[PDB]
Ligand binder design. Structure first.
Ligand SMILES: Cn1cnc(CNC(=O)c2cc(-c3ccc(F)cc3)cc(O)c2O)c1
Ligand SMILES: [Cl-]
Ligand SMILES: [Cl-]
Ligand SMILES: [Cl-]
Ligand SMILES: [Mg+2]
Length: 213
């Protein structure tokens, strides 16, 4: 089997069904003790939690679900009725993410879409009945952060106050995105320094709040 299958199985056998916190703890334990994986992790996860709680977004888009760690993290803190859409281009990972959400009991709050974000973003308004997004979590291929941000704007999915939160702006880094948002009058940016998941290596999140045209 794959690392991702092994992570899912560990959760199923070491967490309590319907208990998202136990799911996060199980993944963190597995990835610290057994096999590293590119989940956002606890250090950066705590920063994400603080941001989610500050904004209480009604509609969140995540780019890059992977195994669903961040989707569980965010969805567990959403208010009743609030929703998460998460995109994952790898079908095997999309299936892991669905099963992870199912186990966590969060499947009614989250929709996991299998496809490249550049292909799905233009369908959000008509197919998924989206008006604008309250928050976007970027965690997919690092060279897609900038083009997909520009695509979100083109498609009319950003509003004044839409919070972009980007993982991995130090490692692996996303230099074009980071330069762009920090240099743009349409974004107000804040850097949250942290650590790479499960590693004593500096990383960070960037929050970029959209200001309109
Ligand atoms: C498999 N996959 C398909 N798309 C993606 C998008 N994400 C990343 O590439 C990603 C990578 C790293 C990372 C990898 C190696 C390393 F040495 C240090 C950091 C960490 C993350 O948090 C990430 O999100 C991953
Ligand atoms: Cl994650
Ligand atoms: Cl993608
Ligand atoms: Cl961590
Ligand atoms: Mg990441």
């Amino acid at each position: 089997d794959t690392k991702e299958q092994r992570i899912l199985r560990y959760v199923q056998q070491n967490a309590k069904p319907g208990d998202p916190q136990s799911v996060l703890e199980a993944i963190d334990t597995y990835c610290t003790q057994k096999e590293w994986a590119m989940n956002v992790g606890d250090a950066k996860g705590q920063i994400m939690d603080a941001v989610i709680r500050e904004y209480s977004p009604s509609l969140v888009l995540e780019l890059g679900a992977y195994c669903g760690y961040s989707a569980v993290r965010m969805a567990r803190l959403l208010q009743p009725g609030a929703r998460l859409l998460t995109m994952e281009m790898n079908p095997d990972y999309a299936a892991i993410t669905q099963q992870m959400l199912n186990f966590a009991g969060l499947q009614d709050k989250v929709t996991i879409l299998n496809g490249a974000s550049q292909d799905l973003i233009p369908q959000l308004k008509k197919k998924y009945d989206v008006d604008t997004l309250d928050m976007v979590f970027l965690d997919h291929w690092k060279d897609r952060y900038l083009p997909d941000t520009l695509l979100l704007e083109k498609c009319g999915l950003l509003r004044k106050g839409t919070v972009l939160l980007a993982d991995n702006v130090i490692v692996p880094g996303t230099p074009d995105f980071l330069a762009y948002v920090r240099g743009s009058s349409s974004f107000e940016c804040t850097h949250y320094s942290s650590y790479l998941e499960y590693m004593k290596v500096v990383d960070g999140l960037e929050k970029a709040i959209y200001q309109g045209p």
